[PDB]
């Protein structure tokens, strides 16, 4: 579909595993906010957007509808389950690497379906918990998802990293290596 | 033999062309990854995309209150939200940072810019190079910035000056960065 | 100032 700009107001997800759901708005392929369903709280991704208010019950009520709709579809489909897709992983830095200068490692996990994934980081082989963050599941027009994880870091000659991905489409956890060069 | 999962998605999608001259709403109901039924504002009523959406399309097209809410959505949702985008996301300007480094290849790193429109070109002594140039796709960082890298195959002579030339809507004039052997 | 959401409706029985 031809468009200068495309928005999603919003993306509504619900799935039996968990079960679990997600509510986001997207504009030109970036996430504007998600609703924390458990906390009943809108969480904006861009500071200029924090002046706005979105009622979290919109998300919760929509997910209620989706729960019923998933029920009807499982029933109507004679229990046709989701196909596991093999995800694609890429690791890159946000800015060119200067040793000693704050950078950010970025792990793009693409072609996620169903939306259940573990993305964690390793440094020289041991897990890294501080400096980590991630987007929500972001929509694609083929109805799979992608997800981006971040790790802040000071690049250093003797310190390499891996983005580690676990998913039902993968036989074993996937490691994507990054070197400071 | 991984866990079984069933997924339902609802996407309220607005397509904008030329400001708000042309606006189009497509609400998609997806079971797993198959879109089963959609409301397209250019059609004016629900349509089954696949067999599984035929009951929903027939039911929803019979509910006048639902139909009239869908037809109003292109104004209540798409056009209303675009007015908020015009004050915020469509005002977002992040100027690209441009650096050159060798790899024989020259790499022009154009990092952290928004929005996506960008033009990057290589010059050798103020002659534009089109041979031996490799460009990454536009890279979405997920935090509302993009990056792109443009590689130049090079065999420099003494006195050669290589210029990376960057044009972006946030700039009052193109950025140029030079590199000499 | 609040962005408006599009709303889903219940699938038939």
């Amino acid at each position: 579909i031809v468009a200068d700009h495309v928005a999603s107001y919003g993306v509504n997800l619900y799935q039996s595993y968990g079960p679990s759901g997600q509510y986001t708005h997207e504009f030109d392929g970036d996430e504007q906010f998600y609703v924390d369903l458990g906390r009943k709280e809108t969480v904006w991704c861009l500071p200029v957007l924090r002046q706005f208010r979105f009622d979290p019950q919109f998300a919760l009520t929509n997910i209620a509808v989706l729960k019923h709709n998933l029920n009807s579809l499982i029933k109507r489909s004679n229990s046709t389950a989701a196909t596991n897709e093999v995800p694609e992983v890429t690791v890159f830095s946000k800015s060119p690497v200067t040793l000693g200068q704050p950078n950010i490692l970025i792990c793009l996990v693409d072609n996620i379906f169903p939306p259940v994934v573990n993305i964690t980081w390793l440094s020289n082989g041991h897990s890294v918990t501080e400096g980590v963050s991630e987007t929500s599941f972001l929509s694609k027009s083929d109805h799979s998802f992608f997800k981006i994880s971040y790790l802040t870091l000071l690049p250093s000659a003797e310190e390499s990293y891996d983005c580690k991905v676990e998913h039902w489409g993968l036989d074993k956890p996937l490691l994507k290596h990054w070197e400071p060069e | 033999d991984s866990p079984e999962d069933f997924v339902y998605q609802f996407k309220g999608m607005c397509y904008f062309t030329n400001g708000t001259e042309r606006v189009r709403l497509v609400s998609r109901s997806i079971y797993n990854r198959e879109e089963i039924v959609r409301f397209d504002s250019d059609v004016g009523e629900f349509r089954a995309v696949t067999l599984l959406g035929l009951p929903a399309a027939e039911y929803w097209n019979s509910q006048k209150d639902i139909l009239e809410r869908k037809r109003a959505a292109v104004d209540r949702v798409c056009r209303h939200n675009y007015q908020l985008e015009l004050r915020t996301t469509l005002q977002r300007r992040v100027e690209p940072t441009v650096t050159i480094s060798p790899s024989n290849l020259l790499v022009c790193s154009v990092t952290d810019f928004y929005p996506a429109q960008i033009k990057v070109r290589w010059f050798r002594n103020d002659q534009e190079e089109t041979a031996g140039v490799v460009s990454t796709p536009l890279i979405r960082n997920g935090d509302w910035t993009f990056q792109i890298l443009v590689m130049l195959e090079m065999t420099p002579q003494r006195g050669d000056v290589y210029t990376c030339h960057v044009e972006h809507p946030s700039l009052q004039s193109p950025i140029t960065v030079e590199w000499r052997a | 100032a609040a962005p408006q959401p599009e709303l889903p409706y219940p699938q038939p029985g």
Partner: antibody, heavy 120, light 108 residues
Framework: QVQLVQSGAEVKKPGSSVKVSCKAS??????????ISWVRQAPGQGLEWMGG????????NYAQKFQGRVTITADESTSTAYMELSSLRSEDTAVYYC???????????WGQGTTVTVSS | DIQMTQSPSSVSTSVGDRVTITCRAS??????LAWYQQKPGKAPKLLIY???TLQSGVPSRFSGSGSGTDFTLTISTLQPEDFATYYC?????????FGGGTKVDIKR
């Protein structure tokens, strides 16, 4: 269209608790995704929203005035929603109403109301 | 919370008159406004939702208009069965809130 039928009139002593019920019958698929609200009306006063819950999903909503003193629950399996008010005082004497809305299209169906009288 | 202010508190009118009731919100609520009619001893009955959409079965002489903060309910040719109390209610955000009500009685 669904019908909401509430439990009968109640007389309660000051300090006790009451639990009013609301049972849904004969609805379409709309009743499986609707939101139940509880509205009270004191003698001679206006309508006052207390809180609500979606029976099929999630937790209950409450107004500040009734926070911590009212509890709203629901049971999908019996098509019944409940409102429990504790530490009753004379000011709680009122008509308590059950109502539903489908995706905020107004509260289109109401129960007949329940009278709760607080006196010793 | 969002305060709903109805004016006037009461109005007297005659059969066949046009009557206009006003509701004001303490902040912008877009079109998320509903109107109800209540007669003594009875449950409220929904007339209008989405500020201007007429609930099925409701007589055509009831209409609503407005957006943002100011809203009106108009009864175009008031009938004897229309003397009652009318309530607006905001559907913008939770907690939901009702206006104070407007009682419409017979002039004489």
């Amino acid at each position: 269209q669904v019908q909401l039928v509430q439990s009968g009139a109640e007389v309660k002593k000051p300090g006790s608790s009451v639990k009013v019920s609301c049972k849904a019958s004969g609805g379409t698929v709309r009743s499986r995704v609707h939101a139940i609200s509880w509205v009270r009306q004191a003698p001679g006063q206006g309508l006052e929203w207390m809180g609500g819950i979606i029976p099929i999903f999630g937790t209950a909503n409450y107004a500040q005035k009734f926070q911590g003193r009212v509890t709203i629950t629901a049971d999908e399996s019996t098509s019944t929603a409940y409102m429990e008010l504790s530490s009753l005082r004379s000011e709680d004497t009122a008509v308590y109403y059950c109502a539903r809305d489908v995706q905020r299209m107004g509260m289109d169906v109401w129960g007949q109301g329940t009278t709760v009288t607080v006196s010793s | 919370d969002i305060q709903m202010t109805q004016s006037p508190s009461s109005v007297s009118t005659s059969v066949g008159d046009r009557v206009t009731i006003t509701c004001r919100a303490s902040q912008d609520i877009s079109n998320w406004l509903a109107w109800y009619q209540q007669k003594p001893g009875k449950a409220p009955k929904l007339l209008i939702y989405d500020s201007s959409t007429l609930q099925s079965g409701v007589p055509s002489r009831f209409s609503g208009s407005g957006s943002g903060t100011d809203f009106t309910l108009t009864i175009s040719t008031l009938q004897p069965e229309d003397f009652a109390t009318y309530y607006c209610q905001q559907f913008n955000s939770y907690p939901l809130t009702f206006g104070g009500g407007t009682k419409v009685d017979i002039k004489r």
